[PDB]
Amino acid sequence: QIYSARYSGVDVYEFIHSTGSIMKRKKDDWVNATHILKAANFAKAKRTRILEKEVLKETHEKVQGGFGKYQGTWVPLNIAKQLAEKFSVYDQLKPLFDF
C-alpha cells in the first residue's frame, strides 16, 4: 500500500515494501534511490558503492542532513525508473512510480 506522509517538512508518498518503505516526493516526483537499492536487497557497503558509481554522476540531491527515513540520495523519476530496472525491482516498485 501507499500512504501519504510528511518528513522534515516534505510531503511524500510512502510505499510499504518488505525491505522497508520507498518514498516519492509529491512536489516533484523525485524518488529516494537509496530506498530503491535497499529494495534490491543490497547491503550498505554495496549500496554506497553503487550510489557513488551509478547515481552521483546523475542529477540528484544528497539529503544527509534531513534526519529520518527521509535521508538518502534523491533522483528524478525517470532516473529512478532506470535504476529500478537495472537492479530488477522495477515491477515491484511500479505501483509507486505510476502512483
Indicate which CATH number applies to the domain containing 81.
Answer: 3.10.260.10
Question: Could you tell me whether strands 61-63 and 72-75 are parallel, antiparallel, or unpaired per DSSP bridges?
Answer: antiparallel
Neighbours of 22 (CB within 10 A): 29
What residues make up the domain containing 91?
A: 1-99
Q: 2: which strand partners?
A: 15
Contact 97, 80 (CB under 8 A): yes
The C-alpha cell of 73 is what?
540520495
How many structural domains does the chain have?
A: 1
Tell me the three cell numbers of residue 5: 506522509
Four-residue CA torsion sign, 19, 20, 26, 27? negative
Resolution of this entry, Å: 1.7
E strands present in the chain:
2-7, 10-16, 21-25, 31-32, 61-63, 72-75
Report which of 30, 38, 39, 11 is spatially closest to residue 80, judged by C-alpha positions.
Answer: 30
